[PDB]
């Protein structure tokens, strides 16, 4: 299958650009990370920082996750993040996304040994 840590990398990491391309950034990334294979993933966030900086969030501020679990952590600093969300024109197999880029704190759930990100909970 895919491990939880590897799925978090594929779905949420983009260390190759400092910030969302243009308005088409999300259409391109949602497709290349295979998030539009059988259906259009409705919402997905990409973090534009090194993998090491995102992994380090797991030893930063411990905060509750939205679902009540207590293994979430909020980055001490803001990070460049792009939220990708389907627009009304989106309809599989022609997915379409709005791209919203901003500098926000990343909140991730962590698990395992090594203790690394396994879910993206929110940005603030
Ligand atoms: Cl892995
Ligand atoms: Cl892999
Ligand atoms: Cl894949
Ligand atoms: Cl997300
Ligand atoms: Cl996730």
PDB file of C-alpha atoms and ligand atoms in Angstrom:
ATOM      1  CA  UNK A   1       0.000   0.000   0.000  1.00  0.00           C
ATOM      2  CA  UNK A   2       1.384   3.360   1.027  1.00  0.00           C
ATOM      3  CA  UNK A   3       2.559   4.142   4.527  1.00  0.00           C
ATOM      4  CA  UNK A   4       0.946   6.958   6.445  1.00  0.00           C
ATOM      5  CA  UNK A   5       4.114   9.046   6.405  1.00  0.00           C
ATOM      6  CA  UNK A   6       4.629   8.559   2.659  1.00  0.00           C
ATOM      7  CA  UNK A   7       0.973   9.466   1.971  1.00  0.00           C
ATOM      8  CA  UNK A   8       1.420  12.704   3.957  1.00  0.00           C
ATOM      9  CA  UNK A   9       4.503  13.527   1.877  1.00  0.00           C
ATOM     10  CA  UNK A  10       2.767  12.932  -1.428  1.00  0.00           C
ATOM     11  CA  UNK A  11      -0.410  14.787  -0.460  1.00  0.00           C
ATOM     12  CA  UNK A  12       1.049  17.731   1.407  1.00  0.00           C
ATOM     13  CA  UNK A  13       4.626  18.514   0.621  1.00  0.00           C
ATOM     14  CA  UNK A  14       5.888  20.843  -2.143  1.00  0.00           C
ATOM     15  CA  UNK A  15       9.444  21.833  -1.317  1.00  0.00           C
ATOM     16  CA  UNK A  16      10.240  22.703  -4.935  1.00  0.00           C
ATOM     17  CA  UNK A  17       8.573  26.082  -5.145  1.00  0.00           C
ATOM     18  CA  UNK A  18       8.428  28.913  -2.656  1.00  0.00           C
ATOM     19  CA  UNK A  19       4.760  29.543  -3.279  1.00  0.00           C
ATOM     20  CA  UNK A  20       1.912  28.601  -5.557  1.00  0.00           C
ATOM     21  CA  UNK A  21       2.644  29.011  -9.153  1.00  0.00           C
ATOM     22  CA  UNK A  22      -0.333  30.927 -10.506  1.00  0.00           C
ATOM     23  CA  UNK A  23      -4.025  30.201 -10.383  1.00  0.00           C
ATOM     24  CA  UNK A  24      -3.303  26.899 -12.203  1.00  0.00           C
ATOM     25  CA  UNK A  25      -0.945  25.596  -9.480  1.00  0.00           C
ATOM     26  CA  UNK A  26      -3.629  23.469  -7.862  1.00  0.00           C
ATOM     27  CA  UNK A  27      -4.991  21.871 -11.042  1.00  0.00           C
ATOM     28  CA  UNK A  28      -1.440  20.814 -11.912  1.00  0.00           C
ATOM     29  CA  UNK A  29      -0.401  19.561  -8.453  1.00  0.00           C
ATOM     30  CA  UNK A  30      -3.653  17.796  -7.652  1.00  0.00           C
ATOM     31  CA  UNK A  31      -3.158  15.849 -10.868  1.00  0.00           C
ATOM     32  CA  UNK A  32       0.577  15.135 -10.576  1.00  0.00           C
ATOM     33  CA  UNK A  33       0.281  13.953  -6.926  1.00  0.00           C
ATOM     34  CA  UNK A  34      -2.456  11.566  -8.075  1.00  0.00           C
ATOM     35  CA  UNK A  35      -5.248  13.142  -6.084  1.00  0.00           C
ATOM     36  CA  UNK A  36      -7.638  13.158  -9.049  1.00  0.00           C
ATOM     37  CA  UNK A  37      -7.289   9.531 -10.155  1.00  0.00           C
ATOM     38  CA  UNK A  38     -10.770   8.104  -9.593  1.00  0.00           C
ATOM     39  CA  UNK A  39     -12.444  11.118  -8.077  1.00  0.00           C
ATOM     40  CA  UNK A  40     -11.520  14.756  -7.395  1.00  0.00           C
ATOM     41  CA  UNK A  41     -10.158  15.130  -3.855  1.00  0.00           C
ATOM     42  CA  UNK A  42     -12.271  18.039  -2.573  1.00  0.00           C
ATOM     43  CA  UNK A  43      -9.752  19.912  -0.463  1.00  0.00           C
ATOM     44  CA  UNK A  44      -5.994  19.571  -0.161  1.00  0.00           C
ATOM     45  CA  UNK A  45      -3.205  21.698   1.288  1.00  0.00           C
ATOM     46  CA  UNK A  46       0.425  21.820   0.039  1.00  0.00           C
ATOM     47  CA  UNK A  47       3.184  23.179   2.271  1.00  0.00           C
ATOM     48  CA  UNK A  48       6.099  25.000   0.552  1.00  0.00           C
ATOM     49  CA  UNK A  49       8.860  24.311   3.048  1.00  0.00           C
ATOM     50  CA  UNK A  50      11.544  21.665   3.306  1.00  0.00           C
ATOM     51  CA  UNK A  51      10.459  18.217   4.446  1.00  0.00           C
ATOM     52  CA  UNK A  52      12.773  18.590   7.460  1.00  0.00           C
ATOM     53  CA  UNK A  53      11.025  21.845   8.558  1.00  0.00           C
ATOM     54  CA  UNK A  54       7.556  20.191   8.297  1.00  0.00           C
ATOM     55  CA  UNK A  55       8.765  17.073  10.140  1.00  0.00           C
ATOM     56  CA  UNK A  56      10.157  19.328  12.880  1.00  0.00           C
ATOM     57  CA  UNK A  57       6.636  20.583  13.591  1.00  0.00           C
ATOM     58  CA  UNK A  58       6.070  17.255  15.421  1.00  0.00           C
ATOM     59  CA  UNK A  59       8.193  18.540  18.298  1.00  0.00           C
ATOM     60  CA  UNK A  60       6.752  22.083  18.313  1.00  0.00           C
ATOM     61  CA  UNK A  61       3.428  23.226  19.935  1.00  0.00           C
ATOM     62  CA  UNK A  62       1.190  20.351  20.978  1.00  0.00           C
ATOM     63  CA  UNK A  63      -2.461  21.308  20.329  1.00  0.00           C
ATOM     64  CA  UNK A  64      -5.729  19.467  20.000  1.00  0.00           C
ATOM     65  CA  UNK A  65      -6.727  18.216  16.555  1.00  0.00           C
ATOM     66  CA  UNK A  66     -10.236  19.106  15.286  1.00  0.00           C
ATOM     67  CA  UNK A  67     -11.370  15.543  15.856  1.00  0.00           C
ATOM     68  CA  UNK A  68     -10.327  15.588  19.509  1.00  0.00           C
ATOM     69  CA  UNK A  69      -7.138  13.532  19.213  1.00  0.00           C
ATOM     70  CA  UNK A  70      -4.151  15.043  21.037  1.00  0.00           C
ATOM     71  CA  UNK A  71      -1.260  14.268  18.664  1.00  0.00           C
ATOM     72  CA  UNK A  72      -1.506  17.528  16.693  1.00  0.00           C
ATOM     73  CA  UNK A  73       1.210  20.157  16.576  1.00  0.00           C
ATOM     74  CA  UNK A  74       1.154  23.738  15.358  1.00  0.00           C
ATOM     75  CA  UNK A  75       4.231  25.167  13.703  1.00  0.00           C
ATOM     76  CA  UNK A  76       5.865  27.899  15.734  1.00  0.00           C
ATOM     77  CA  UNK A  77       6.443  29.949  12.590  1.00  0.00           C
ATOM     78  CA  UNK A  78       4.230  30.650   9.649  1.00  0.00           C
ATOM     79  CA  UNK A  79       4.943  28.638   6.528  1.00  0.00           C
ATOM     80  CA  UNK A  80       4.136  29.233   2.849  1.00  0.00           C
ATOM     81  CA  UNK A  81       0.987  27.156   2.176  1.00  0.00           C
ATOM     82  CA  UNK A  82      -1.379  26.695  -0.740  1.00  0.00           C
ATOM     83  CA  UNK A  83      -4.981  25.517  -0.150  1.00  0.00           C
ATOM     84  CA  UNK A  84      -6.532  23.750  -3.175  1.00  0.00           C
ATOM     85  CA  UNK A  85     -10.309  23.405  -3.276  1.00  0.00           C
ATOM     86  CA  UNK A  86     -12.724  22.381  -6.016  1.00  0.00           C
ATOM     87  CA  UNK A  87     -14.721  25.150  -7.678  1.00  0.00           C
ATOM     88  CA  UNK A  88     -18.305  24.808  -8.838  1.00  0.00           C
ATOM     89  CA  UNK A  89     -17.128  24.010 -12.405  1.00  0.00           C
ATOM     90  CA  UNK A  90     -15.258  20.940 -11.124  1.00  0.00           C
ATOM     91  CA  UNK A  91     -16.679  17.603 -12.252  1.00  0.00           C
ATOM     92  CA  UNK A  92     -14.701  14.364 -12.523  1.00  0.00           C
ATOM     93  CA  UNK A  93     -12.900  13.585 -14.765  1.00  0.00           C
ATOM     94  CA  UNK A  94     -12.406  17.320 -15.315  1.00  0.00           C
ATOM     95  CA  UNK A  95     -11.444  18.447 -11.855  1.00  0.00           C
ATOM     96  CA  UNK A  96     -10.927  22.167 -11.307  1.00  0.00           C
ATOM     97  CA  UNK A  97      -9.444  23.875  -8.293  1.00  0.00           C
ATOM     98  CA  UNK A  98      -9.116  27.300  -6.789  1.00  0.00           C
ATOM     99  CA  UNK A  99      -5.582  28.092  -5.559  1.00  0.00           C
ATOM    100  CA  UNK A 100      -5.237  30.193  -2.357  1.00  0.00           C
ATOM    101  CA  UNK A 101      -1.658  30.969  -1.240  1.00  0.00           C
ATOM    102  CA  UNK A 102      -0.787  32.459   2.127  1.00  0.00           C
ATOM    103  CA  UNK A 103       1.715  32.322   5.015  1.00  0.00           C
ATOM    104  CA  UNK A 104       0.040  30.497   7.850  1.00  0.00           C
ATOM    105  CA  UNK A 105       0.862  28.144  10.744  1.00  0.00           C
ATOM    106  CA  UNK A 106       0.684  24.492   9.796  1.00  0.00           C
ATOM    107  CA  UNK A 107      -1.136  22.056  12.116  1.00  0.00           C
ATOM    108  CA  UNK A 108      -0.297  18.398  11.580  1.00  0.00           C
ATOM    109  CA  UNK A 109      -1.032  15.143  13.377  1.00  0.00           C
ATOM    110  CA  UNK A 110       2.055  13.068  14.132  1.00  0.00           C
ATOM    111  CA  UNK A 111       2.602   9.377  14.771  1.00  0.00           C
ATOM    112  CA  UNK A 112       5.197   6.658  14.748  1.00  0.00           C
ATOM    113  CA  UNK A 113       8.864   6.069  15.311  1.00  0.00           C
ATOM    114  CA  UNK A 114      10.262   8.294  13.862  1.00  0.00           C
ATOM    115  CA  UNK A 115       7.434  10.546  15.044  1.00  0.00           C
ATOM    116  CA  UNK A 116       6.457  12.280  11.774  1.00  0.00           C
ATOM    117  CA  UNK A 117       3.434  13.955  10.142  1.00  0.00           C
ATOM    118  CA  UNK A 118       0.649  11.652   9.078  1.00  0.00           C
ATOM    119  CA  UNK A 119      -2.238  14.074   8.585  1.00  0.00           C
ATOM    120  CA  UNK A 120      -2.699  17.762   7.762  1.00  0.00           C
ATOM    121  CA  UNK A 121      -5.335  19.159  10.182  1.00  0.00           C
ATOM    122  CA  UNK A 122      -5.519  22.868   9.383  1.00  0.00           C
ATOM    123  CA  UNK A 123      -3.652  26.046   8.732  1.00  0.00           C
ATOM    124  CA  UNK A 124      -4.024  29.232  10.739  1.00  0.00           C
TER     125      UNK A 124
HETATM  126 CL1  LIG B   1       7.703   5.891   4.806  1.00  0.00          CL
HETATM  127 CL1  LIG B   2       7.011   6.272  -2.157  1.00  0.00          CL
HETATM  128 CL1  LIG B   3       0.810   7.757  -6.134  1.00  0.00          CL
HETATM  129 CL1  LIG B   4      -5.692  19.165   3.489  1.00  0.00          CL
HETATM  130 CL1  LIG B   5      -4.139  14.516   5.596  1.00  0.00          CL
END
